[PDB]
Amino acid sequence: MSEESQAFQRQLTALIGYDVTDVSNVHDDELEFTRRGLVTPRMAEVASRDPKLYAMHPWVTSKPLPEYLWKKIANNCIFIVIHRSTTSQTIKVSPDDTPGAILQSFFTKMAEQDFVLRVCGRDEYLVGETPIKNFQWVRHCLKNGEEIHVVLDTPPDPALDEVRKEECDRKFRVKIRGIDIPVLPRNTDLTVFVEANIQHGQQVLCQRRTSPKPFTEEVLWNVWLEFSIKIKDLPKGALLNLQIYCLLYYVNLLLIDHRFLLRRGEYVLHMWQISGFNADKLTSATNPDKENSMSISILLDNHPIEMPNQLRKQLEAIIATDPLNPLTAEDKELLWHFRYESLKHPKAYPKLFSSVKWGQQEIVAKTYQLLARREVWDQSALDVGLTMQLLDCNFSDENVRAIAVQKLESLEDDDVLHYLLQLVQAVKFEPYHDSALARFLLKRGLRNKRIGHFLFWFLRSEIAQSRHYQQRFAVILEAYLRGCGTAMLHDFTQQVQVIEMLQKVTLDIKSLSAEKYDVSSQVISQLKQKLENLQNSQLPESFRVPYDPGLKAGALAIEKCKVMASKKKPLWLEFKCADPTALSNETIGIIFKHGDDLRQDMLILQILRIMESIWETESLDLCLLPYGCISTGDKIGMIEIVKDATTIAKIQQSTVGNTGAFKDEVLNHWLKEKSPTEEKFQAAVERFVYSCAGYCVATFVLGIGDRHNDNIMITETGNLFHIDFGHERVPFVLTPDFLFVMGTSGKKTSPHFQKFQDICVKAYLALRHHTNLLIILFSMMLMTGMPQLTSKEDIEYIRDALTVGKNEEDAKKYFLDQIEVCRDKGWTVQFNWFLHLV
Ligand SMILES: CC(=O)Nc1ccc2c(c1)OCCc1cc(C(=O)N(C)c3ccccc3Cl)sc1-2
Prior knowledge:
Helices cover 42% and strands 16% of the residues. Helix 3 runs parallel beside helix 18 and helix 19 packs antiparallel against helix 20. The radius of gyration is 29 Å and the shape is globular. The chain binds ligand FAZ. The ligand CC(=O)Nc1ccc2c(c1)OCCc1cc(C(=O)N(C)c3ccccc3Cl)sc1-2 is lined by residues 564, 566, 570, 591, 593, 627, 639-642, 645-646, 723-724.
């Protein structure tokens, strides 16, 4: 192994944020085994991909152009403006024309083909045999009444993507020797015992406890715990979960390893402490802090492997229930007995597999037999909600999860991007490091630069702040980095250097000030100085914007930089675009913040993006504005600065605003004053109506509707939008001023208001057609992103919000009433936010 390669592993370690060659925290070889196992999948995808399309990563879709976008094209023509150094002729185009085709209606239309079309000021290319209406940039330009500006240039050299070459029927039992913790001191000396559970898909097959003993820094039971389950009956993927009750600490050990061998021998496991139901409780990793943590020693000495009319009605009823409906023992017995009928309803699959007795070898075998004749499933139309249901904490069986991944195989790149964060979060529910899901993400990321970019940041986000999963995600990220190509690698290196520098600055400045005071010139002077120093050497000529990889940021515009006045003291940075072909002088705004887990915001924003695509599948545009947000490290990251935007509170505050008085007409005035004409003003009011509806609906369903005015913004162009998603009542925010813009006051009516209620209802029922998708996303969001959330009651909110079980009439009713409540409450809740502080 050349000294060069060691230097390389060193480089990867600095991009990843973890050393995957570190063996300090392992009790076996699963991780190393996996690093090797992933070599094959990587090399296969790298060698399979087309160098040209890979270099230009065109962003395309197979979905049809929505109705609301055809409206802007009634002439069946689209104008593309090509530029190549001075003047620029604007080619008339047909929504069906191909990039190579408009190149024909050009050269000859003018009068050597080794050239390509690139969006101006972006690393974005319109290539491949795809209709121009199928390009995301084209649809983005239409939805925004913007012109499509392109530049003629030379295709990127695929050479630049070169990848470096690589080179017994007995019952199961376990002995609990004892537990050891360096220092126990809490308050009153209590007693302690160990609870050992055998689980599979978060289902306890068998449970045993030790006798209670006095809780001292070392407790020695030396006791055998014999379980009712036979060794032969242990399903692969089953965990021996060990817990300390006083619940203080937990830890897990996979009973059967990555080689199909029964675990055996002595183990001293460092446990995780509960912070006084969630994915962290399922980890096979042990606490990396060996110095201050509880440990438990154990010994293992135990290689393997026609329906009557009315009953059919019961079965179908069971199948129609929602993902969260509990399955009764009767239900499970039915689903199982009628196994073969059940297998004819893809939607029954999750309910059916939750009906399997996983602690019985014979039954599991019958199950694989069931999966053998999978014809109905394989030919079923892809249902993302259904596929995700089989990837959650409820299924630990490799094969069951594999058919889910099989269905994902059929997703187009545009959809993978929509679900990526949730798939990645779903890797936490995998019992082994090497899994079909992990390999699928690897594969899709290496196949496409955009998915790879995001995959990188999403993995890095978790590696930096999750002790429970950093090891696994690190192995996966490394596998990806070893295949993305030198170009991407150089880019990631730049992005990481930049954010690392800015992290230093952010922290230092937060120190030079109190917690809550204000922002003085001492602190601002210090900022501009520190930045001035970086601009010289430290901060690279350019770098890709992490939440918008097609955008290249150049030098900082130091005169415009500053520290924002908020509890936390985040930086307000602005950069020049490093692309001369850019169509404007507008800088690139980025907010840098330390002290908050931006992962929750990423999660919400991403679900918001999903809600948009769902509404798109229905021909609806609610004008949401899910700005870029990326967790880059522990409690720190970057956020996109939406241009020409203010807080609804700030609009209020600039006018008197003593103690938080509130006037209904302020908003309308602000909008009228920022509009150059009445035309632009009407457009602003309309957009406000649409965006208000979208955020009201989205926010009610996700159960985040009750927000303070300071957490909601609006663009000068009328787009309302929510922010700061980090962790008496009202369902959402629709205050009298919003109402005022709608032409109503004092519980009255109006054309825009009526239009609003219509949009809300259309939006709401449009989501109910996706009820399962939303429910499964909501619960995965809770399990992998929040603290220890009740696997029932917290999650049940969404079932109620989507009013599952009701017909259309009762739903509309429920929401309209919801709209009335905000009205009756007026300014009440908003007003309350100020007093709680006094
Ligand atoms: C002129 C103008 O005020 N521009 C401006 C200010 C703030 C934002 C913005 C534009 O757009 C990007 C969307 C956004 C999201 C934010 C957020 O999540 N949090 C949590 C937050 C809240 C307050 C302060 C800082 C932050 Cl990061 S802040 C913010």
